[PDB]
Structure 1
Amino acid sequence: MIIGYARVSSLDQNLERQLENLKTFGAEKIFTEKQSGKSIENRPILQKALNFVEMGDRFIVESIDRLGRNYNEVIHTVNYLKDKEVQLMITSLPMMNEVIGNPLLDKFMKDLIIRILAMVSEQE
C-alpha cells in the first residue's frame, strides 16, 4: 500500500499543494498533521503513520523536512522505515529510489542522499 504523510506548522502554508503532490505519486491514505517539525516526541499523527505502514508498503512525503527539522531524528525515522522494510519516497526528489551501482554502493549512496536532505532540513 502507498501511504502519505503531510505536515504544516500553520494554516498559512499551502497544505492543498502538499496533498496534491502526495496524490500525484499515488498515496491512497494520507495522514495530515498540524505541528512543528522540531520534534518527533510531540507528533502523534506521524507516529500513527509509522505504526500503520507494514513490510512492502511505500511511505511518501513531499520533502524530508515534513518528517522533521532535526537531522538526528529524521535519520532515526528513516532507519525505522528501513528496518520495517517500508520504502521511503520523496515527491520532490523521485530520483532517490533509483539504484546506484552494486548493493554496497547503492545503500551507501542512499545513506548519503538522506543525510544531505536531513542536513538541509535542519540547516534551513
Structure 2
Amino acid sequence: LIGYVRVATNDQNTDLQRNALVCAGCEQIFEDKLSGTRTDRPGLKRALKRLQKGDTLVVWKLDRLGRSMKHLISLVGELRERGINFRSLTDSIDTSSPMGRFFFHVMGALAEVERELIIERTMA
C-alpha cells in the first residue's frame, strides 16, 4: 500500500519509478538521497511512522533499499512479527506466505553476496 524509492542525486529517473509504483497500486510517496550513507536510513524513518498492521510495503528492487542482508533480514522480519507484510515488484516476491519468504531471503542473500563480490573486485 505504501511506496519508497532510492537514488543518488538525480531525480528524473525516480519519476518513471514513481509512475510504475502508482500503477502497481500504492498510496503514498517516499524518496531519499544517497549522498552520505546508504545503510543509515534518512527519510525512510517516516515510512516506518506512517505504517500500520495488515498494510504492505512497495519496493521496485531489493538492491535499491540497503543491500546488506544482515541489516535487511533484521528489519523486514520485525514487521513479519508486527503483523505487516512486504512485496517486491520486479524482484517478484512477497513475504505474505512462508513459501514466499523463501525467494525473498535468497534474493536478499544474493543482493548482499552481489555487493560483497562487486566491492572486493575494486581492490585487486
Normalised TM-score (structure 2): 0.76
| Corresponding residue of 2:51 | 53
Distance 1:66 1:13, change over 3 A: farther
Higher helix share: 1
Name the CA distance, whole Å, in 1 between partners of 2:76 and 2:108: 10
Q: Which amino acid aligns with 1:3?
A: I
Name the CA distance, whole Å, in 1 between partners of 2:30 and 2:63: 15
2:69 to 68, 71, 78: 71
> Percent identity among equivalent residues?
30
Name the CA distance, whole Å, in 2 between partners of 1:114 and 1:98: 7
Higher strand share: 1
2:17 counterpart of 1:10? no
CA contact (8 A) 2:95 2:104 kept: no
Q: Which amino acid aligns with 1:9?
A: A
Distance 1:118 1:12, change over 3 A: same
Runs of 4+ in 1 over 4 A off after TM superposition: none
Name the CA distance, whole Å, in 2 between partners of 1:83 and 1:47: 19
Q: Which has the larger radius of gyration?
A: 2
Normalised TM-score (structure 1): 0.76
* Secondary structure of 2:22's aligned partner: helix
| Corresponding residue of 2:121 | none
Name the CA distance, whole Å, in 2 between partners of 1:83 and 1:115: 16
* Secondary structure of 2:47's aligned partner: helix
Please, which runs of 5 or more residues in structure 1 have no aligned partner? 100-105
Q: Which amino acid aligns with 2:8?
A: S
2:74 counterpart of 1:80? no
| Corresponding residue of 1:114 | 104
| Corresponding residue of 1:103 | none
